[PDB]
Design an enzyme around this catalytic site. Structure first.
Site, PDB file in Angstrom:
ATOM      1  N   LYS A 146       5.794   9.216  -8.844  1.00  0.00           N
ATOM      2  CA  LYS A 146       6.016  10.472  -8.190  1.00  0.00           C
ATOM      3  C   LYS A 146       7.542  10.737  -7.632  1.00  0.00           C
ATOM      4  O   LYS A 146       8.316  11.877  -7.359  1.00  0.00           O
ATOM      5  CB  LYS A 146       6.027  10.096  -6.100  1.00  0.00           C
TER       6      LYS A 146
ATOM      7  N   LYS B  66       0.312  -1.633   0.177  1.00  0.00           N
ATOM      8  CA  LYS B  66       0.083   0.110   0.203  1.00  0.00           C
ATOM      9  C   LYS B  66       1.111   1.327   0.028  1.00  0.00           C
ATOM     10  O   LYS B  66       2.031   0.875   0.512  1.00  0.00           O
ATOM     11  CB  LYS B  66      -1.263  -0.499   1.235  1.00  0.00           C
TER      12      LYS B  66
ATOM     13  N   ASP C 237      -1.360   1.687  -5.697  1.00  0.00           N
ATOM     14  CA  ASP C 237      -2.040   0.189  -5.752  1.00  0.00           C
ATOM     15  C   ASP C 237      -2.181  -0.459  -7.491  1.00  0.00           C
ATOM     16  O   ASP C 237      -3.201  -1.222  -7.763  1.00  0.00           O
ATOM     17  CB  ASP C 237      -3.175   1.453  -6.462  1.00  0.00           C
TER      18      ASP C 237
ATOM     19  N   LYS D  14       7.198   1.690   1.591  1.00  0.00           N
ATOM     20  CA  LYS D  14       7.928   0.434   0.343  1.00  0.00           C
ATOM     21  C   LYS D  14       9.491   1.408   0.354  1.00  0.00           C
ATOM     22  O   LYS D  14      10.944   0.346   0.220  1.00  0.00           O
ATOM     23  CB  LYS D  14       6.860   0.465  -0.706  1.00  0.00           C
TER      24      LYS D  14
END
Ligand SMILES: Nc1ncnc2c1ncn2[C@@H]1O[C@H](COP(=O)(O)OP(=O)(O)CP(=O)(O)O)[C@@H](O)[C@H]1O
Ligand SMILES: Nc1ncnc2c1ncn2[C@@H]1O[C@H](COP(=O)(O)OP(=O)(O)O)[C@@H](O)[C@H]1O
Ligand code: ICS
Ligand code: CLF
Ligand code: SF4
Ligand SMILES: [Fe+3]
Ligand SMILES: [Mg+2]
Ligand SMILES: [Mg+2]
EC number: 1.18.6.1
Lengths: 477, 522, 276, 271
Positions: free
Chosen positions: C41, C10, C129, C15
């Site tokens: 990002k 998530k 996602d 991560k």
């Protein structure tokens, strides 16, 4: 004509653009110097088109499906994605072939996965697997399948390589996934390259460890002739009359087995450098097979090509070469005697794709005509390098020309004849300028070889000298 | 070789013995071709009911579709407005195909631009392409209006046309008041006709949505006409002609008839004629709006009823006798103008032709395809003529349309052997004309390959193609014809009966064999 | 002998932090590592390089004209312990197609031969996602062979783990990619370790390591470094070394068996979630 | 005067829970509301419906073949307080194109007149990873006119706020969508409320409400309910009613001025 004047015309035409487009287009227009050997010093090419200026260019899918893969006659080519691309390209290009269509050959047909919205959202790999099963059911004599990606396939990340591998193994069939989604590259050209690489990776090495084909020292392949109106056939007949054996032609009237046998030849004869130089270089690096460019447009180039090719072999072939040249000499001399007096001094402007803008010049000159402007949709600078020495001093060169530019140039240069594509044709006919389609040959041809020259000459004369061109102005005006 | 005084092009050049010999060597030497007996066996199999069952079990594969994609239609719609440049936001390959496709059917220039979104525009979005594209297009081709639609890559990534266009204006790439109507036209939804509907509703919205307050239904005393996707010049022309003949004030909304038929007089005219911006702005003041092709004008209809408050008549396409009658009576009802003696006489002349030709038409069996309104009008007129539609295909049709055509078939004893297919293609249709052979096909140029296939089975199995529809690429100037109204019905009737008679002459041309029936008088 | 691993879990579960600290630990023990950032990002290599930037493949392609004009030297840079770093790049939120950016970027890396074999590990750091095929590019054939899923003992993190496993099964069966384990990035929940161990068993995998919540992470992060570089003998640095060693020695690689929503709810209830 | 609102924020920040609890409270007040889930995992209405199966637009379309064959009453359901619920739906992870799923679903709702009927509010619940144009479908012209961004006092959550505001600007400049405020979903960090109030002012908006961290939210969720339904008298339930009241009476709608990643680092040190 006159260098300062042509440079003046270029700057005048450029005045209409916004600054960003003006600055860019300036780099894609040039006045020729035959002296110049590095075209990079004179013109820029193979760059993205400016938005909104009505480029004549197509997309990587056109370059891959439409040009390279589409002609291969015993394979089935899937236009993978929504229904548009395969329908507009269905049988629009006259890549001629001999076969029983729908049974052992499939060139004029349009196979497609006809993507719907649920296919976009949920992905199309399951649909593609099922589609491949149905192809095998309904077309059992097909000798391989290609999967030609359209735009959405490339965006949504469908794994067509995995599908090709799994179904390929399950059905013992060559299945070739091609990532030619149309937004890649800037033109048809990257489609050529992507397609060449797909041939390299999925087809060409199939017989690498097979020695059952009996080769001879006179084995050649015709590389990059798509047999438009039978062009490749009227080239192949000359090579074979000269004593050579043509094991393959890529890819006009081509078959997948010819492609697989091509690594066994002694010499690759490359007509279209732009679209097939990639696999040509590959074949020299992997198989040691040399390649050479040739030109079969008109008698001067054909004769020169035949001798150059024959010098690559031995005395027997060179003897047969001169015998072929002797055979056809009275034929093309009669063509010149008949048509050159009707065309002498006439001035031509060309705009075509990646080869023909330089390649057909010799033929026009064999009829005493003058090419006063030429240019390409998608050529690279190694193409312009070969062009500048073929064109006269102070002739106009234009790369990725806009609809507006081409019209303005034509209004000032006032050619007797224009040779370009279907999207150009009807514009210039209305201006009263004889126009010949130099992609489709205007549903005529062949134009390659000696037999082709007679048709080329007939066609130029029929159009340039047609009685319709005198009739455009109403007498009462 | 060539003889200079009788030069041979590809046909029949390659029939020469030396070319035939060379081709035989190419085949046998290198093509590893299936043996001819195997090819013949498979071909024969593809003509069978067994193959047909396999063929109609297809769920994933499409072969030889009989439709195109949305933006093709958006472009054609946009071409119908005065000095309007069609502009397709997305990838430039699309626009080269749209223009070429139309070039080949109309044999005319087709002007349209792209903003050439490349790989990095797919990733970052096409906002900068829209800004530079609109400024560039406006400076270079000087349109009065730019009509924006989309290619499928811009639809997958959700480029917001509205936002992109307004930011181009806000940042001064194009003037704020310069009209840039838009429509999203995803190729993976519906077909080219859906794109026409979407573009039109977008243009209608752009000119009327914000100014409804001073509108009054009926105040300009005209009837609006919305033609839909139309590729016969004669069809735009006949509607204008009949309305003028009646003295009915009208406004044809999207009218590409001039720009698709400019004179060759020494100048290229990028734009000609078309619906004016003032005509669109004033359209809500019409008495009513008539949709010529309702089965692909559903979005337009919703907007026109809900926003202009026009009581859009429930009318079929004006094709054939009955439906042209109904069109004229409704126009008469709306405008208050009587149907004039001249149109009544025209009607009676069509009826005369029908009586004159009915014996050769009676019972003739047809397969046919095309767009939904066109196909249903052709089915209706075939029934009026005492013909039997047998295989009716509309690749881009839907379930409601199919039920509507079944009902039309059921209302005539000549519709008893007919089946309507939706979502099926010309490879499906191929099987049908083998397993249940009709006398003729009525369709577009793609049908020529079916005729070729049927002849290969045998001359007695050949099904001749009659070219009516879009695109027609392999004959010249048929785009000038008419299919609507009494005039279009006369042209269609003439084409059908003389197709029948042409075939009968061919079949009876055999000296001392069949020519006992090669009658001078028919 | 080059091992490719893809890190999923998530958004905001940790991560990128865990991946870069893990990778730094790996480099610190002598491994040659490349990190491929697959998150638009583009913050997946910030802690390895020092400075918060690195020019991305997509933006450099846009600068040079097209992807074809791009040179590997322009977008692949070395940071801490000689780790090689690259970012796909992508659009700002709500425009464009980040998925295609990852597709373009990974095809480019493959084509330009960035997978040199002077590498012991390639790690892909992937968007939370995973909303399209592009974000599964790292687990296609000849890409990542091992998947590690970062989660925690919170309901939302465990559902995501389970949802991501659903997507995995397709690529595990078409190819050779396998799930190597769950990494528990702690959120200090009650009985967090037992809860993740239990979820791991349901899926058929393991909890490969429990990473404590330590604010030495927030310290190193504003200092734009890994903990491994910031404070080599922090207890959290030893935690990443431990995780690093386990990853190197792991042999448990399975096809996951996702559970239902009802099963996940029952599990959390077993561990006291309804207790006040 | 139907008000359309879109909820954005950092992945995992509490968008869906906050939205549903908010909407329950609106419905409790007598407001008529529709929730539109814009996330392929389709979990935006789970707490409002919780009885009987929910079918998504994209799933139902696939079964029917196209969106045109779909009817609005097949995918639009009413749950707690008569709140109307619909989910875009979309693929499982790693396949297809979820972005296009949201475009398609909202186009469908528009075409089928979902926005007829007299709703006071529509809320779009969007996912955290706004990776393409499709996930900004809710803030196009004629859709959401008010954006509420859920954040917290954690760095990642403020950077998300700023970066989302960045994405909002091209739509705000071109249309009428506006930022309505920040919703602070607390992570119990030091002086969280003051800090989010501070970020609000740099952006130019407001912190419309501070939502405490309360594990009753999670207990309600496990039971597939909002706090409003699960425990109508809980402290946290009162917080959501408070939030709902502010939203009802809110008039503050601005264009965001995103700040540098440097200014953000300045903010977090100065606290
Ligand atoms: N005020 C609060 N106190 C305690 N827990 C809360 C809370 N608000 C939300 N949560 C919990 O946080 C978890 C995530 O909530 P939610 O699903 O609403 O986030 P989100 O919608 O932003 C995830 P995504 O980004 O994938 O769309 C849920 O388990 C929820 O119960
Ligand atoms: N073990 C840990 N202890 C404390 N904070 C952590 C830890 N791991 C991650 N974080 C913090 O949580 C936030 C999100 O982590 P990040 O790696 O960016 O998440 P993702 O990569 O899943 O989007 C970062 O601010 C990070 O510093
Ligand atoms: S392949 Fe190429 S545009 Fe070399 S894409 Fe194009 S059938 Fe042209 S100038 Mo159409 S590089 Fe062939 C060409 Fe030349 S389709 Fe034909 S005529 S010799
Ligand atoms: S560059 Fe295709 S024509 Fe297009 S809107 Fe999509 S269905 Fe229609 Fe090239 S691959 Fe093809 S032709 Fe274009 S879409 Fe891309
Ligand atoms: S979901 Fe993935 S593929 Fe579809 S547009 Fe968004 S990013 Fe691109
Ligand atoms: Fe014409
Ligand atoms: Mg990250
Ligand atoms: Mg959510």
């Amino acid at each position: 004509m006159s260098r300062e004047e042509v440079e003046s015309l270029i700057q005048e035409v450029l005045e209409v653009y916004p600054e960003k487009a003006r600055k860019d287009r300036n780099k894609h227009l040039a006045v020729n110097d035959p002296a110049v050997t590095q075209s990079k010093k004179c013109i820029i090419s193979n760059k993205k088109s400016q938005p909104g200026l009505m480029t004549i260019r197509g997309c990587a899918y056109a370059g891959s499906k439409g040009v390279v893969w589409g002609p291969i006659k015993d394979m089935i080519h899937i236009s993978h994605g929504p229904v548009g691309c395969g329908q507009y390209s269905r049988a629009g290009r006259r890549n001629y072939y001999i076969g029983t269509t729908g049974v052992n050959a499939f060139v004029t047909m349009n196979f497609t996965s006809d993507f719907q919205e649920k296919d976009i959202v949920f992905g199309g790999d399951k649909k593609l697997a099922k589609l491949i099963d149905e192809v095998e059911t309904l077309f059992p004599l097909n000798k391989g399948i290609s999967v030609q990606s359209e735009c959405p396939i490339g965006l949504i990340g469908d794994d067509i390589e995995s599908v090709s591998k799994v179904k390929g193994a399950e059905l013992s069939k060559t299945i070739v996934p091609v990532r030619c989604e149309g937004f890649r590259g800037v033109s048809q050209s990257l489609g050529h390259h992507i397609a060449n690489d797909a041939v390299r990776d999925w087809v060409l090495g199939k017989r690498d460890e097979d020695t059952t084909f009996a080769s001879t020292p006179y084995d050649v392949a015709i590389i990059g002739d798509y047999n438009i109106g039978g062009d490749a056939w009227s080239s192949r007949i000359l090579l074979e009359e000269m004593g050579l054996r043509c094991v393959a032609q890529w890819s006009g009237d081509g078959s997948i087995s010819e492609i697989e046998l091509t690594p066994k030849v002694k010499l690759n004869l490359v007509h279209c450098y732009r679209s097939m130089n990639y696999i040509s270089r590959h074949m020299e690096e992997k198989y040691g097979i040399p390649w050479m460019e040739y030109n079969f447009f008109g008698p001067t180039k054909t004769i020169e090509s035949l001798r150059a090719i024959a010098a690559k072999f031995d005395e027997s072939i060179q003897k047969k070469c001169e015998e072929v040249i002797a055979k056809y000499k009275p034929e093309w001399e009669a063509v010149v005697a008949k048509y050159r007096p009707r065309l002498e001094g006439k001035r031509v402007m060309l705009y075509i794709g990646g080869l023909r803008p330089r390649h057909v010049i010799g033929a026009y000159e064999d009829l005493g005509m003058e090419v006063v402007g030429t240019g390409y949709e998608f050529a690279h600078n190694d193409d312009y390098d070969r062009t500048m020495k073929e064109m006269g001093d102070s002739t106009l060169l234009y790369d990725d020309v806009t609809g507006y530019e081409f019209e303005e140039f034509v209004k000032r240069i006032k050619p007797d004849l224009i040779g370009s594509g279907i999207k150009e044709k009807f514009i210039f006919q209305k201006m009263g300028i004889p126009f010949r389609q130099m992609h489709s040959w205007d549903y005529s041809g062949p134009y390659h070889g000696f037999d082709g020259f007679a048709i080329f000459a007939r066609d130029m004369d029929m159009t340039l000298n047609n009685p319709c061109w005198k009739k455009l102005q109403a007498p009462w005006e | 070789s060539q003889q200079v005084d009788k030069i041979k092009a590809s046909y029949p050049l390659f029939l020469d013995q030396d070319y035939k010999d060379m081709l035989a060597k190419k085949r046998d030497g290198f093509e590893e071709k299936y043996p001819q007996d195997k090819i013949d066996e498979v071909f024969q199999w593809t003509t069978t009911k067994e193959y047909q069952e396999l063929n109609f079990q297809r769920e994933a594969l499409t072969v030889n579709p009989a439709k195109a994609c949305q933006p093709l239609g958006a472009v054609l719609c946009a071409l119908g407005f005065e000095k309007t440049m069609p502009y397709v936001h997305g990838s430039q390959g699309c626009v080269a195909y749209f223009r070429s496709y139309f070039n080949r059917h109309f044999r005319e220039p087709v002007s349209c631009v792209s903003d050439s979104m490349t790989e990095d525009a797919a990733v970052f979005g096409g906002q900068q392409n829209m800004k530079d594209g609109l400024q560039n297009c406006k400076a270079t081709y000087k349109p009065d209006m730019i009509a924006v639609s989309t290619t499928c890559m811009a639809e997958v990534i959700g480029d917001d046309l509205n936002a992109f266009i307004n930011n181009s204006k806000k940042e001064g790439f194009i003037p704020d008041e310069f009209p840039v109507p838009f429509a999203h036209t995803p190729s993976f939804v519906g077909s080219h006709v859906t794109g026409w509907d979407n573009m039109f509703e977008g243009i209608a919205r752009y000119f009327t949505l914000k100014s409804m307050d001073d509108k009054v239904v009926g105040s300009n005393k005209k009837i609006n006409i919305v033609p839909g996707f139309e590729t016969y010049l004669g069809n735009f022309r006949v509607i204008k002609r009949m309305l003028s003949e009646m003295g009915v004030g009208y406004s044809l909304l999207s009218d590409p008839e001039e720009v698709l038929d400019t004179p060759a007089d020494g100048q290229f005219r990028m734009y000609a004629g078309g619906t004016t911006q003032e005509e669109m702005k004033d359209a809500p003041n019409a008495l009513n709006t008539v949709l010529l092709q309702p089965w692909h004008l559903e979005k337009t209809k919703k907007f026109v009823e809900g926003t202009w408050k026009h009581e859009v008549p429930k009318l079929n396409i004006p094709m054939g006798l009955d439906w042209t009658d109904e069109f004229l009576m409704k126009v008469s009802e709306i405008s208050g103008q009587p149907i004039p003696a001249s149109l009544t006489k025209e009607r009676g002349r069509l009826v005369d032709m029908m009586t004159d030709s009915h014996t050769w038409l009676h019972g003739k069996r047809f397969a046919l395809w095309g767009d939904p309104d066109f196909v249903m009008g052709l089915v209706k007129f075939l029934l009026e003529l005492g013909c039997e539609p047998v295989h009716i295909l509309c690749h881009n049709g839907n379930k409601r349309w199919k039920k509507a055509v079944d009902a039309i078939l059921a209302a005539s004893p000549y519709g008893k052997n007919a089946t309507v297919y939706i979502g099926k293609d010309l490879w499906h249709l191929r099987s049908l004309v083998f397993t249940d052979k009709p006398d003729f096909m009525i369709g577009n140029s793609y049908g020529k390959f079916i005729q070729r296939d049927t002849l290969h089975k045998g001359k007695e199995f050949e099904v001749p193609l009659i070219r009516i529809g879009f695109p027609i690429f392999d004959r010249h100037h048929l785009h000038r014809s008419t299919t609507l109204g009494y005039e279009g019905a006369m042209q269609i009737l003439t084409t059908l009966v003389n197709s029948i008679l042409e075939r009968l002459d061919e079949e009876t041309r055999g000296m001392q064999a069949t020519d006992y029936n090669h009658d001078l008088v028919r | 002998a080059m091992r490719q691993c893809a890190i999923y879990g998530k958004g905001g579960i940790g991560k990128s932090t865990t991946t870069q600290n893990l990778v730094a630990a790996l480099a610190e023990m002598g491994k040659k590592v490349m990190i491929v950032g697959c998150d638009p990002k583009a913050d997946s290599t910030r802690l390895i390089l020092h400075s918060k930037a690195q020019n991305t493949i997509m933006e450099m392609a846009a600068e040079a004209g097209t992807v074809e004009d791009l040179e590997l030297e322009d977008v692949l840079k070395a940071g801490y312990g000689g780790v090689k770093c690259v970012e796909s790049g992508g659009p700002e939120p709500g425009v464009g197609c980040a998925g295609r950016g990852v597709i373009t970027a990974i095809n480019f890396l493959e084509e330009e031969g960035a997978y040199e074999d002077d590498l012991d590990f390639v790690f892909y750091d992937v968007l939370g996602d995973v909303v399209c095929g592009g974000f599964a590019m790292p687990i296609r054939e000849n890409k990542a062979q091992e998947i590690y899923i970062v989660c925690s003992g919170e309901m939302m993190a465990m559902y995501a783990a389970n949802n991501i496993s659903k997507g995995i099964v397709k690529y595990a069966n078409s190819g050779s990619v396998r799930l190597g384990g769950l990494i528990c990035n702690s959120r200090n929940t009650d009985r967090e370790d037992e809860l993740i161990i239990a979820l791991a068993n349901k899926l058929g995998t393991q909890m490969i390591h429990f990473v404590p919540r330590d604010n030495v992470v927030q310290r190193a992060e504003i200092r734009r470094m890994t903990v491994i570089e910031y404070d080599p003998k922090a207890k959290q640095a030893d935690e990443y070394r431990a995780l690093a060693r386990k990853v190197v020695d792991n042999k448990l690689l399975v096809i996951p068996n996702p559970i239902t929503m009802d099963e996940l709810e029952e599990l959390l209830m077993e561990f006291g979630i309804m207790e006040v």
